[PDB]
Ligand binder design. Structure first.
Ligand SMILES: Cc1cc2nc3c(=O)[nH]c(=O)nc-3n(C[C@H](O)[C@H](O)[C@H](O)COP(=O)(O)OP(=O)(O)OC[C@H]3O[C@@H](n4cnc5c(N)ncnc54)[C@H](O)[C@@H]3O)c2cc1C
Ligand SMILES: Cc1cc2nc3c(=O)[nH]c(=O)nc-3n(C[C@H](O)[C@H](O)[C@H](O)COP(=O)(O)OP(=O)(O)OC[C@H]3O[C@@H](n4cnc5c(N)ncnc54)[C@H](O)[C@@H]3O)c2cc1C
Lengths: 340, 340
């Protein structure tokens, strides 16, 4: 049939690929089209630090924990292939430093070799007295998106540069099903008082010698409002801010300083690092991910809509699990229409 | 007095700086000259992989077990300094993969977070059934030599490009003490059957996405006759050859393929790595490191000679603990000769 996906970030292209991948063989014309106002370099996904790591706190809707676990194994299974890196995927080991002892996270068994830090190791970070170590995966937002768009292109999925004004618009257009993957920018399509922006800023730097990631935590100031250093495919992401309710899209020198001096006390060799860029992004902060089916009708119309947005600061980390879900709900639409 | 150090590799320059730091403030005129027929870019130390790791096999002269540990505490103690990376030092984590279980190494507790690989992680390396994981350090020999030469230069230590034909030649040159740090070429100045070269070849590639080190072991081929991938400051080192008794300084086309094919089977993503260099060096293969005193009376002369060579594949790994040793034997001399 005719499927339209609004959104070209990790969640949108991920959901698309997954859908076409599992139903193209049964559906006659399966017309999948992606609409989005901004693409690749300009999505929230490219500004991502590119690390697999759910929050240190448990989620409401434990259904999100299984989605994180799914993504990990999907990505881990490519850690074999010769094209893993072209996808923006690669293994990394690192630390999560704390000022006081905290309980283990619920994902301690999802990652590789998680263990508490020994005394010697903490002497490398005098400012912290507690912490963990483990190996995870790197999913460079920028590169992963190019790969996803390429995989789709070959499958016949078409890309349109357009800012959808409302569902009806796409509906009239002729979409039988609509996949809403518009991140923090939802609301504009349908009001959602629960979906707010979580402004984050990062500095891109050239420190090829930094091979391990380091995330620090200030349990008083909130998650990611503490300096972190995350190496990527060929640049290191320096970060430290998470401001809720802030729609300011411009780099703030006020934050520039916090991140830089915060990261330079943590890793003094950064004084030689060369800044390659500074970007700002809005995490789709929502008390819970919205992933459900909704029936919107317009007289003789009756269009189908499936949502999948509001993944806060764990979009890359949970993307695939969420995608499998949508595909599953998409399967129940065909069933309801007698399509198998 | 006059101390003449023969050898400008990691063992010579280190011993040089160690002697200076400890006795400079006491001996009236402390002359220190370093002679070498080949410098930095061209020493065996510049061809090193850079990993801090002794052989898996138990040692001989448990004396080496402590020189290794000293050297590690020396290097680790630089991880907080802003000059760590400019010395060629940075932390790395990695794997040691085997085809069958083997006893733990004696240095297991010398490094950080040592542990055995689990089933999941093994599925990442299909050809191996056992392994360890631990964090260590990179001591890029290249950077380290330039770093030491600068530190020595600001200290008054003069360098001389001169090939030493005999110890006598130097004892007559006007030198009271001699530190023999001539590497695999020591025998040329005093026959030594126990010493032989351990030729090895290595491929320098550009694969910045590789963050961890991978070392495979083929128990039936000896040591480092299995591939290994060691990420460096800004280039990655491919390797896997150990040929004792071979003195060819040129690259063997076959050895190139044993390394390349083997590392690609281990790490598929290499197919897109752009080779940057290939080198060949000879490890100072000796059943035991030779660090000892040897008076050499040359008619009235009487020069003291201290030997520090034959470190095979663990020169960088054990350098500092040896220099600390030369400095003490030198203390003795200083005392007997009664300059203190
Ligand atoms: C600084 C920073 C670092 C981060 N680091 C990490 C990390 O390490 N790991 C992690 O998992 N997560 C991280 N995140 C969060 C992660 O980036 C997000 O969860 C993820 O990008 C959300 O994906 P998305 O689908 O919302 O897509 P987005 O890319 O945000 O948006 C997809 C598309 O929606 C389109 N769109 C929106 N409105 C409309 C409209 N009206 N019409 C048409 N198209 C529209 C956009 O044009 C866009 O292309 C980070 C976030 C920030 C800000
Ligand atoms: C491929 C490869 C990889 C390696 N990887 C590692 C690793 O990861 N970790 C590790 O710890 N070790 C490694 N090693 C071993 C390490 O490189 C050696 O143990 C170390 O370089 C030995 O130092 P050296 O003191 O012998 O110095 P070298 O640099 O070999 O020699 C020092 C000096 O001796 C001078 N010299 C010799 N004879 C004379 C003479 N007659 N007159 C004047 N000057 C003379 C030379 O000119 C030179 O400047 C590796 C070796 C190889 C070949």
């Amino acid at each position: 049939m005719r499927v339209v996906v609004i959104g070209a970030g990790v969640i949108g292209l991920s959901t698309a690929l997954c859908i076409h991948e599992r139903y193209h063989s049964v559906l006659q014309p399966l017309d999948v089209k992606v609409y989005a106002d901004r693409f690749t370099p300009f999505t929230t996904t490219d500004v991502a630090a590119g690390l697999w790591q759910p929050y240190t706190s448990e989620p409401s809707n434990p259904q999100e924990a299984n989605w994180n676990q799914q993504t990990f194994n999907y990505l881990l299974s490519h850690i074999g292939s010769p094209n893993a890196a072209n996808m923006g995927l690669t293994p990394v080991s690192g630390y999560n430093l704390f000022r006081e002892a905290v309980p283990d996270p619920y994902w301690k068994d999802m990652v590789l070799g998680f263990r508490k830090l020994t005394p010697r190791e903490l002497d490398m970070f005098p400012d912290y007295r507690y912490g963990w170590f483990n190996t995870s995966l790197i999913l460079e937002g920028r590169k992963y998106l190019q790969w996803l768009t390429e995989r789709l292109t070959e499958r016949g999925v078409k890309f349109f540069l357009r800012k959808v004004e409302s569902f009806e618009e796409v509906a009239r257009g002729g979409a039988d099903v609509i996949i809403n993957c518009t991140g923090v920018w939802a609301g504009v399509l349908q009001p959602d008082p629960l979906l707010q922006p979580g402004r984050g800023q990062i500095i891109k730097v050239d420190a090829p010698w930094l091979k391990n990631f380091i995330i620090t935590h200030d349990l008083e100031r909130g998650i990611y409002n503490s300096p972190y250093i995350i190496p990527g495919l060929q640049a290191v992401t320096l970060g430290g801010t998470f401001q809720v309710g802030n729609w300011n899209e411009i780099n703030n020198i006020q934050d520039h300083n916090t991140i830089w001096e915060g990261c330079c006390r943590l890793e003094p060799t950064l004084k030689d690092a060369k800044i390659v860029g500074e970007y700002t992004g809005f995490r789709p902060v929502r008390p819970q991910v919205r992933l459900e089916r909704e029936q919107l009708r317009f007289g003789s119309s009756n269009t189908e809509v499936i949502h999948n947005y509001g993944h806060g600061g764990y979009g890359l980390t949970i993307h695939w699990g969420c995608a499998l879900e949508v595909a599953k709900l998409f399967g129940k639409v065909l069933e309801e229409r007698n399509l198998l």
